[PDB]
């Protein structure tokens, strides 16, 4: 869809991913963006979009 959407997992990798509007097409930059993991209901670091 000309946006090539990315999905990351939490620090612990448990439950489902977090889908995000963060783009990879136009610029190479840091993918860590700190988001909510609903298994702990806490804000944590997010990793690996593959």
């Amino acid at each position: 869809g000309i946006r090539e959407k990315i999905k990351l997992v939490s620090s612990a990798g448990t439950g489902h991913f977090y889908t995000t509007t963060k783009n990879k097409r136009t610029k190479p930059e840091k993918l860590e963006l700190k988001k909510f993991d609903p298994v702990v209901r806490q804000h944590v670091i997010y990793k690996e979009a593959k």
Binding site: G1, R3, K5, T19, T20, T21
Partner: protein
């Protein structure tokens, strides 16, 4: 001949006691990341037809 319930409505609605039909509603199957988060929190709960919007629906669903 015994009069037929229309397939177009029969496989899209759930009935009630008092009247009005309960259903899942649109815009919650196709490409979710591109849609607003407030909208996705408003479409998660299912929808219902009220008595003022019901006449059009029983004209496709005749039976109890």
């Amino acid at each position: 001949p015994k009069i037929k319930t229309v397939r177009g409505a029969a496989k899209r609605f759930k009935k009630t006691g008092k009247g009005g039909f309960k259903h899942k509603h649109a815009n919650l199957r196709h490409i979710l990341t591109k849609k607003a988060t407030k909208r996705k929190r408003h479409l998660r709960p299912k929808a219902m037809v009220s008595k003022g919007d019901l006449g059009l629906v029983i004209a496709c669903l005749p039976y109890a």
